Design an enzyme around this catalytic site. Structure first.
Site, PDB file in Angstrom:
ATOM      1  N   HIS A 163      12.313 -15.335  -1.678  1.00  0.00           N
ATOM      2  CA  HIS A 163      12.812 -14.323  -0.766  1.00  0.00           C
ATOM      3  C   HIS A 163      14.200 -13.802  -1.223  1.00  0.00           C
ATOM      4  O   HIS A 163      15.169 -13.826  -0.492  1.00  0.00           O
ATOM      5  CB  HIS A 163      12.792 -14.866   0.677  1.00  0.00           C
ATOM      6  N   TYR A 170       7.245  -1.676   9.133  1.00  0.00           N
ATOM      7  CA  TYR A 170       8.243  -1.242  10.068  1.00  0.00           C
ATOM      8  C   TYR A 170       7.937   0.176  10.580  1.00  0.00           C
ATOM      9  O   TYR A 170       8.065   0.449  11.789  1.00  0.00           O
ATOM     10  CB  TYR A 170       9.715  -1.438   9.484  1.00  0.00           C
ATOM     11  N   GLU A 175       5.194  -9.519   8.474  1.00  0.00           N
ATOM     12  CA  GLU A 175       6.411  -9.055   9.185  1.00  0.00           C
ATOM     13  C   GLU A 175       6.175  -7.811  10.052  1.00  0.00           C
ATOM     14  O   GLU A 175       5.771  -6.763   9.564  1.00  0.00           O
ATOM     15  CB  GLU A 175       7.518  -8.732   8.211  1.00  0.00           C
ATOM     16  N   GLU A 194       8.245  -9.073  -0.350  1.00  0.00           N
ATOM     17  CA  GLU A 194       8.682  -7.727  -0.709  1.00  0.00           C
ATOM     18  C   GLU A 194       9.278  -7.497  -2.126  1.00  0.00           C
ATOM     19  O   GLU A 194      10.420  -7.126  -2.259  1.00  0.00           O
ATOM     20  CB  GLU A 194       9.680  -7.228   0.339  1.00  0.00           C
ATOM     21  N   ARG A 235       6.915 -18.977   9.426  1.00  0.00           N
ATOM     22  CA  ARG A 235       7.085 -18.608   8.048  1.00  0.00           C
ATOM     23  C   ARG A 235       8.503 -18.718   7.699  1.00  0.00           C
ATOM     24  O   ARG A 235       9.349 -18.172   8.416  1.00  0.00           O
ATOM     25  CB  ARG A 235       6.529 -17.203   7.816  1.00  0.00           C
TER      26      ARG A 235
HETATM   27  O1  LIG Z   1      13.746  -5.098   8.388  1.00  0.00           O
HETATM   28  C1  LIG Z   1      14.011  -5.589   7.080  1.00  0.00           C
HETATM   29  C2  LIG Z   1      13.153  -6.823   6.809  1.00  0.00           C
HETATM   30  C3  LIG Z   1      14.116  -7.959   6.564  1.00  0.00           C
HETATM   31  O2  LIG Z   1      14.486  -8.478   7.820  1.00  0.00           O
HETATM   32  C4  LIG Z   1      13.286  -8.955   5.840  1.00  0.00           C
HETATM   33  O3  LIG Z   1      14.112  -9.963   5.227  1.00  0.00           O
HETATM   34  C5  LIG Z   1      12.558  -8.090   4.786  1.00  0.00           C
HETATM   35  O4  LIG Z   1      11.261  -8.735   4.498  1.00  0.00           O
HETATM   36  C6  LIG Z   1      12.396  -6.672   5.479  1.00  0.00           C
HETATM   37  N1  LIG Z   1      12.927  -5.545   4.650  1.00  0.00           N
HETATM   38  C7  LIG Z   1      12.362  -4.159   4.826  1.00  0.00           C
HETATM   39  C8  LIG Z   1      11.918  -3.556   3.457  1.00  0.00           C
HETATM   40  C9  LIG Z   1      12.702  -2.270   3.032  1.00  0.00           C
HETATM   41  C10 LIG Z   1      14.287  -2.436   3.161  1.00  0.00           C
HETATM   42  C11 LIG Z   1      14.680  -2.972   4.581  1.00  0.00           C
HETATM   43  C12 LIG Z   1      13.376  -3.197   5.494  1.00  0.00           C
END
Ligand SMILES: OC[C@@H]1[C@@H](O)[C@H](O)[C@@H](O)[C@@H]1NC1CCCCC1
Length: 467
Positions: A125, A309, A375, A171, A79
């Site tokens: 992006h 995350y 992600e 995002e 991607r």
């Molecule tokens: O860990 C952050 C990843 C970035 O690496 C990627 O570019 C993006 O899709 C993502 N961002 C997250 C979203 C909330 C603010 C930081 C974490």
């Protein structure tokens, strides 16, 4: 104890990167400036080490080697994102098509296919052409819709005969919130000392994203999807939101916290209006859809991409801003006990069952036919002063992905039609407001010399993919 046989025959295992974080060559092959070049150059203080993506990790000159390394890990898909301002220096079509630009992406696309790697492409992006931010405020104006829609159309035409997966936006919650509420991300609006209004701008910007999103998706279904036989969708991020305790006040909190983060985009695309609780609480500060945009927004995507995350706990709360509008206090602790292990910057907590719950919820609330985990990754400190030999052995990342694939397998077993998992960062890259102080990669990059070397997680990954 998760093996590829535990997943359908049919699942994709990939990794990803983005154009501004990876490509570099900001001022080469006639690329025009993005808002991230500007933010990073006019506001170095806003960047933790005052660094930038000028050179980033130099993917634009090193793509052949990079594809080699992808194939060495056995990636099934990669991607990436097109820099809008690398294909159209001034955003609109009046200011030119950049043929150096379009030759680069044809080279990069054909090289992925030559190595058996399926390309999956993001249109946007965060790297907005600076000419469009200057001219009419980018996503602060409805003017973005037609301009985005022509960029999209150019991309479908120029590359779409080789590409099956298209994402409109990655995002938009982070772009809208961090760019216009907090002033952390380009264009640096809405926080203390910034231009803007954190109570207005985040909502205007998200409305214009959803309309932009829709034009491109209609472009594609009506003019490209029958011939090119691909599919188009959007990438949504969310934390999972656990009730701090099992009292109704906290269930109401979860449902508002999810709503302001995930429903903000997903309720337009399911019913054609924002969620209940956003209408209640943001009121006149939330724009309305026409009856035509509302009806045309129902079902407006072929898949939802989900970035994940971490999870936080959630309870009811005690200057108007998007940040205060849900009414939710977030804490990472319960009885002084964290919800999982705390990673380098203090925000990310490893919480695998956060994924499971967030994928079950998206299916019972929104009935998404096709999910992808687009992600999934862990942050690690950029420790200068150690040998590459120690930096390489990132056992904690290999255990991270193992556990989250566990949760991703558990969601599939309970009926959630998740069709992929994409390790975030393939390569160590530029990290936005944190510049180069951390790493998410499964391949290590010396940020200065650009040399690449696989961590142990990449080799765990190679092995997993081959099962
Ligand atoms: O860990 C952050 C990843 C970035 O690496 C990627 O570019 C993006 O899709 C993502 N961002 C997250 C979203 C909330 C603010 C930081 C974490």
């Amino acid at each position: 104890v998760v093996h590829r046989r535990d997943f359908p025959q049919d699942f994709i295992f990939g990794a990803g990167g983005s154009a501004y974080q990876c490509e570099g060559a900001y001022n080469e092959g006639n690329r025009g400036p993005s808002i991230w070049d500007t933010f990073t150059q006019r506001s170095p203080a806003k960047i933790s080490d005052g660094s930038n993506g000028n050179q980033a990790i130099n993917c634009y000159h090193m793509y052949k080697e990079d594809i080699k390394i992808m194939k060495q890990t056995g990636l099934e898909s990669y991607r990436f994102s097109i820099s809008w301002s690398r294909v159209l220096p001034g955003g609109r079509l009046a200011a030119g098509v950049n043929k150096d630009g379009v030759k680069f992406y044809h080279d990069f696309i054909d090289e992925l296919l030559a190595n058996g790697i399926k390309p999956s492409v993001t249109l946007f992006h965060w790297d907005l052409p600076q000419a469009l931010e200057d001219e009419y405020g980018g996503f602060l104006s409805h003017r973005i819709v037609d301009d985005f829609c022509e960029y999209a159309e150019f991309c479908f035409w120029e590359f779409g005969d080789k590409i099956k997966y298209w994402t409109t936006f990655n995002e938009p919650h982070t772009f809208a919130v961090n760019g216009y509420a907090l002033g952390e991300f380009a264009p640096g609006r809405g926080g203390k000392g910034d231009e803007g209004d954190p109570a207005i701008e985040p909502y205007v910007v998200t409305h214009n994203i959803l309309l932009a999103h829709k034009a491109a998706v209609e472009e594609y279904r009506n003019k490209f999807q029958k011939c090119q036989e691909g599919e188009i969708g959007i990438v949504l991020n969310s934390m999972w939101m656990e009730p701090l305790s099992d009292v109704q006040a906290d269930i109401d909190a979860q449902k508002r916290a999810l709503d302001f983060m995930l429903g903000w985009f997903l309720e337009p695309l399911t019913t054609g209006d924002y969620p209940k609780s956003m209408r209640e609480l943001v009121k006149g500060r939330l724009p309305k859809f026409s009856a035509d945009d509302s009806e045309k927004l129902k079902g407006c995507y072929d898949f939802i991409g989900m970035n994940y995350y971490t999870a936080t706990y959630v309870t009811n709360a005690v200057k108007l801003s998007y940040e205060t509008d849900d009414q939710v206090t977030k804490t990472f602790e319960r009885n002084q006990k964290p919800i999982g292990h705390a990673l380098y910057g203090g925000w990310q907590h490893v919480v695998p069952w956060g994924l499971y719950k967030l994928l079950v919820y998206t299916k019972e609330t929104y009935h998404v036919p096709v999910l992808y985990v687009t992600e999934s990754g862990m942050v690690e400190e950029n420790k200068t002063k150690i040998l590459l030999s120690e930096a390489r052995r990132d056992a904690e990342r290999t255990d991270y992905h193992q556990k989250h694939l566990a949760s991703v397998r558990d969601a599939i077993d309970d009926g959630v039609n998740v069709k992929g998992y994409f390790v975030w960062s393939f390569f160590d890259n530029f990290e936005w407001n944190l510049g180069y102080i951390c790493r998410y990669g499964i391949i290590h990059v010396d940020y200065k010399s650009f040399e690449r070397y696989p961590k142990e997680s990449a080799i765990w990954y190679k092995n997993f993919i081959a099962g």
